[PDB]
Structures are given as C-alpha cells and as structure tokens.
Curated annotation (Swiss-Prot), chain A:
Family of this protein: Belongs to the SKP1 family.
Subunit structure and binding partners: Heterotrimer of an A (ELOA, ELOA2 or ELOA3P), ELOB and ELOC subunit. The elongin BC complex interacts with EPOP; leading to recruit the elongin BC complex to Polycomb group (PcG) target genes, thereby restricting excessive activity of the PRC2/EED-EZH2 complex.
GO cellular component, one term: Cul5-RING ubiquitin ligase complex
Signal peptide: none
SUPFAM superfamilies, A to Z: POZ domain
Entry PTM: Ubiquitinated by the DCX(AMBRA1) complex, leading to its degradation by the proteasome.
Name under which the protein is recorded: Elongin-C
InterPro entries attached to this UniProt entry: ELC1, SKP1-like, SKP1/BTB/POZ_sf, Skp1_comp_POZ
Pfam families: Skp1_POZ
GO molecular function terms noted in the UniProt entry: protein-macromolecule adaptor activity; transcription corepressor binding
Compartments, record wording: Nucleus
Pathway(s) this gene product operates in, as recorded in its UniProt entry: Protein modification; protein ubiquitination
UniProtKB/Swiss-Prot annotation, chain B:
Keyword set, alphabetical order: Acetylation, Host-virus interaction, Nucleus, Phosphoprotein, Transcription, Transcription regulation, Ubl conjugation pathway
PANTHER family: ELONGIN B, TRANSCRIPTION ELONGATION FACTOR B POLYPEPTIDE 2
Organism: Homo sapiens (Human)
Subunit relationships: Heterotrimer of an A (ELOA, ELOA2 or ELOA3P), ELOB and ELOC subunit. The elongin BC complex interacts with EPOP; leading to recruit the elongin BC complex to Polycomb group (PcG) target genes, thereby restricting excessive activity of the PRC2/EED-EZH2 complex.
Name of the gene: ELOB
Listed pathway(s): Protein modification; protein ubiquitination
Role description: SIII, also known as elongin, is a general transcription elongation factor that increases the RNA polymerase II transcription elongation past template-encoded arresting sites. Subunit A is transcriptionally active and its transcription activity is strongly enhanced by binding to the dimeric complex of the SIII regulatory subunits B and C (elongin BC complex).
Any one Gene Ontology BP term: protein ubiquitination
All residue ranges annotated as the Ubiquitin-like domain in the record: 1-66
GO MF annotations, alphabetized: transcription corepressor binding; ubiquitin protein ligase binding
Sites of N-acetylmethionine modification: 1
A Gene Ontology cellular-component term: elongin complex
Localization, UniProt: Nucleus
Name of a matching Pfam family: ubiquitin
Protein name: Elongin-B
UniProtKB/Swiss-Prot annotation, chain C:
Disease: Pheochromocytoma: A catecholamine-producing tumor of chromaffin tissue of the adrenal medulla or sympathetic paraganglia. The cardinal symptom, reflecting the increased secretion of epinephrine and norepinephrine, is hypertension, which may be persistent or intermittent. von Hippel-Lindau disease: VHLD is a dominantly inherited familial cancer syndrome predisposing to a variety of malignant and benign neoplasms, most frequently retinal, cerebellar and spinal hemangioblastoma, renal cell carcinoma (RCC), pheochromocytoma, and pancreatic tumors. VHL type 1 is without pheochromocytoma, type 2 is with pheochromocytoma.
Substitution effect: residue 97 to M: In VHLD; with RCC
Lineage, highest ranks first: Eukaryota, Metazoa, Chordata, Craniata, Vertebrata
Entry function: Involved in the ubiquitination and subsequent proteasomal degradation via the von Hippel-Lindau ubiquitination complex. Seems to act as a target recruitment subunit in the E3 ubiquitin ligase complex and recruits hydroxylated hypoxia-inducible factor (HIF) under normoxic conditions. Involved in transcriptional repression through interaction with HIF1A, HIF1AN and histone deacetylases. Ubiquitinates, in an oxygen-responsive manner, ADRB2. Acts as a negative regulator of mTORC1 by promoting ubiquitination and degradation of RPTOR.
Effect caused by changing residue 73 to K: In VHLD; type I
Source organism (scientific name): Homo sapiens
Curated annotation (Swiss-Prot), chain D:
GN (gene name): BCL2L1
Protein name: Bcl-2-like protein 1
Lineage: Eukaryota, Metazoa, Chordata, Craniata, Vertebrata
Tissue: Bcl-X(S) is expressed at high levels in cells that undergo a high rate of turnover, such as developing lymphocytes. In contrast, Bcl-X(L) is found in tissues containing long-lived postmitotic cells, such as adult brain.
Mitochondrion among keywords: yes
Alphabetized UniProt keyword annotations: Apoptosis, Cytoplasm, Cytoplasmic vesicle, Cytoskeleton, Endocytosis, Membrane, Mitochondrion, Mitochondrion inner membrane, Mitochondrion outer membrane, Nucleus, Phosphoprotein, Synapse, Transmembrane, Transmembrane helix, Ubl conjugation
Annotated coiled-coil segments of the chain: none
Key word Ubl conjugation present: yes
Cellular component GO terms held in the UniProt record: Bcl-2 family protein complex; centrosome; cytoplasm; cytosol; endoplasmic reticulum; mitochondrial inner membrane; mitochondrial matrix; mitochondrial outer membrane
Amino acid sequence: MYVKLISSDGHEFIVKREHALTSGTIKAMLSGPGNEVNFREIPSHVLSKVCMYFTYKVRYTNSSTEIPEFPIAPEIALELLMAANFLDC
Amino acid sequence: MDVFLMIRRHKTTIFTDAKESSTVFELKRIVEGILKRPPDEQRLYKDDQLLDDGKTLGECGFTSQTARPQAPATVGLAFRADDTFEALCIEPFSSPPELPDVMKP
Amino acid sequence: PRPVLRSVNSREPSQVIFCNRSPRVVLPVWLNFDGEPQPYPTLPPGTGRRIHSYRGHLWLFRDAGTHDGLLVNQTELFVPSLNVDGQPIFANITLPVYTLKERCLQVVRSLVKPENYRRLDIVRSLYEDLEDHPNVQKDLERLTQERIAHQ
Amino acid sequence: AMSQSNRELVVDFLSYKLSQKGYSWSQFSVIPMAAVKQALREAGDEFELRYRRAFSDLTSQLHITPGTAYQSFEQVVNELFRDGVNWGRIVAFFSFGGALCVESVDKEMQVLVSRIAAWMATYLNDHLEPWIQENGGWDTFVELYGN
C-alpha cells in the first residue's frame, strides 16, 4: 500500500503509506477530504532526505538493538529543519 | 538481512527494502506491483551495470553496510519501450544552496 | 512532599552494567532520595562499566556534551532490580529515534555558535526551538506529569 | 544517667566539627565513651563525604537566629526521622547539628553554638534514647560503625 509525495521540481517519491504517516502534516492531508500529496515549495533534494528519515524511523522504532545516528550534511541541515518543522516529523 | 533501496527511473523514486538473498527477478516483481510493468519489460541497474535476473541483491553489491535505511542504495530502472529498451535515464535531485557563513567552522 | 521521581533508599545492593551502545559520550544521571539529578562519570561510545547501584534507584542518560536525551533498555528511566543467579542487570544505553525536527535542531546547534543562532535566516519560532536546549529538568517535569496522569 | 553520656557525645562531636573548620569549643561553652566518640566522629566524616548530598539539605529548612525556638529545630529534625530511627539517621542528626554550629560561627552568632548543643541533648533524650535502649545501645553502634 504505497502513496506518492511530489516535490516542487516534479520528482515523484513512492513510499509505503505507513512510512508517509510518520509526518503529522502528510497524515492530516491523506486522512482529510477527497493517493498523492504535492509540495509546491519542498525541492527533491529535501523530500528524498525526508523519505530516508521515514525508512529509518519505521525500521528502528521499538528496536531492542543498537540504532545508528541519522546523518545530516551541513549543506541540507537548515532546509531539512524547515521541512521537518513544516511536515511535523 | 534487509537492504534499503531507491528504485529510480526518470523523475520516479520508489523507497522499498528487500532481503540480501532475494533475486533481481523478485525485485522486478515488486516494481510490477507498483508501476504495472512485468519483469520482462524491466531492466534493473547498479550504476551502468545491467543486473542479471538470477543474481541475489548481495551478489550485485547491495549489502546492509552499503544499503541502509538512512542512506539507501540506488537501483536504476528502464522500461521496454517497443521490442527494445529505452536508455537508462535518472533525473538528478535538486541541489542545496551555498552553506551560509554562520554554519562554517 | 517527596518528589514522585526519586530513588528509594532500599540499601539493597544491585550490580549493574552501564553499556553505551550509542555513538555519544554518555553522562549517567542519578535521581537522589529527594529527586535531585546528580551527574556521574561519563562513558565513551561502545564501552561498558560494572557499577554498584541499589534496588529502586532511578537513572537517566544524556549526551555529556549536548544534553540530548538517550534511552536505556528502550525507555527514559532505568531502575535496578535484585540480581538473579548473581548476574548483573544490563542498562543498554542507545540513541532514541529522535523526531527529524529534533535531529535537525541537534545538527544545526552543532554547526552554529550559540551567539549566531539569532542570525540564521529562519522564522523566530525555529530560532527559539534551537535556543531551548534539551535538559534533564524539562524531561523530569514531563515524566512526572505522565505518571500523575497514570497514577 | 544516659542523659549525661548523650550530652558528652554531643559536645565531643560539635567540638570535632568546629576543630575541623579551625574553631575551639571552650570559647563557645557505663558505655565505652572513648570508643563511641571516635566511631561517631568517623561516622560523621563518612556521612558528610559520601551520603549527605543524597538527601534533602535540612540547613535550607532551618536558619537559626537568636529568636529561633527549640520547637522549630525539633520540627526540622522530626523530618530526618519521618520514617523512624536507625543508626545512619542518628549520624545524620549529629552531622546536622555540626553544620548548624559551623553556620552560626560563620554568621557571627557564636552564642547559638551552646544553644544548639542543648537542643541536640534535649532531642536525643526525648526522641532517640528509647530507640537506642531498644537497639543494643551505643555499644552496638560501635560494633556496626567503629573501626
């Protein structure tokens, strides 16, 4: 069961619904009236990194093992902070 | 042992996982479920290397060290456009801006 | 009034292994008999230490440098029980799965001098998020409120 | 009887704590007494080094001035023994009196040192001697806490 997240530059990200629901904003939009979510102002380099976060969160949540650090390059940190705040994840 | 993948064609990126022991053919069946093209209408690539249907993802170089949830490995996808395959084409993601002064050492 | 989150003076020895399974330098924090947090010596990443504690004592674990919260046996609080068959109690210290927002705040804090947070080209609410550093006191308030809602 | 011995223990312990800070007692003025005094001195040192900071600071709850009543001291010391008496809490009580005497000297209220000694002797006689009688006396304190 997959959903489609679309970036400002028209990149389509196909992710498991369970993964996309990690985002409070995406959960609210998918649970609302009238599947895809289109983000007019989040570019592909940011949205692809957000999808990697969803994969990481679902894999390592409730894990009894050592979990790795979620890595963030300095170059994307500010944009990713703004997107994480906007997307509630 | 799970590997974490981005299956990429044109402006499409699929986020999924598979077993290191699972085959290229089995990954094509995953793609068929999502993008509705059968395995014989798909080519899968690691960089510019065409992957043989028989090989496991591990035998292709997709391991848990190189294909992590937080840093997935890229698999290129091309569709059979007629009797022949389209060229492998993956549109690059956008680029971040210059690092601001206050975020430099 | 005795704080809800405090060590019990059980006087009952419990041998514990603090196992740092995180890439952070870990500051163990003991809640004393009046619930005051008391820092103990740091554990480098991927190191284990056998330590003398007591049944019904309460421990938290933080990043020694940034004060980011860590997990112990997948939860925030560690309480030693009595050793069965003379085997020590394992305190397995790991990273939580931080929210992407908290992880981004951690990285920006690591890259920017505190005096320069206010110069970042971000909305004021995000500047205030950066400035509101994690701390034990904030977490104990929330964990106290959680248990009051439960009790 | 036990009253006089308990009074002597108070004066010995307070004399020790003042001596450690560089003050002498004189200016402020059958059990194995020598063995009890030495064990109480060592137990107080161990309490202050290892244990005091694990508990609520009672010096935050009592600020003794010339006007302070015994009842205020008794109420704060009662908190120490809220869950009953044991040897460790008796050591804490001695250490608390020592800290009050040092604080009084620091704040130039040297007259309170003799008064705190009298208060400790009263509390010991009224609240603690019956428990001591019941729990093997100061002899058993020396067995458990002595060198």
